[PDB]
Amino acid sequence: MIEPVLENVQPNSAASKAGLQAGDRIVKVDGQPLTQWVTFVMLVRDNPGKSLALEIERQGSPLSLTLIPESKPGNGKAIGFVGIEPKGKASPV
């Protein structure tokens, strides 16, 4: 299991609207823990306009949020985008 920490949540984004903040850890997505960051990336990219149910940990306490990716231009199709930068060496999603 992994629990990715957020480094930045862009203003005026799906993630900011969802109430996410830097320091939050994503512990569950749609009722199941993440084991790879790429899984979250694909779930966001593939699902513009859909409601993703998040469980996060905030300072060690659980919170539930609803994240709805915005539709943005993609290389082959429209993709979802939420405006999150994870802690580490990954690209924004």
Q: What is the DSSP string of 7-72?
A: EEE-TTSHHHHHT--TT-EEEEETTB-BS-HHHHHHHHHT-TT--EEEEEEETTEEEEEEE-PEEE
Q: Which residue ranges make up each domain of the chain?
A: 1-93
Domain 1-93: give its CATH architecture.
Roll (2.30)
DSSP letter assigned to residue 27: E
Q: This structure's resolution (angstroms)?
A: 1.6
Give the technique used to solve this structure: X-ray
The answer to whether the beta carbons of residues 93 and 64 sit under 8 Å apart is: no
Which of helix, strand or coil describes residue 6? strand
Residue type at position 76: G
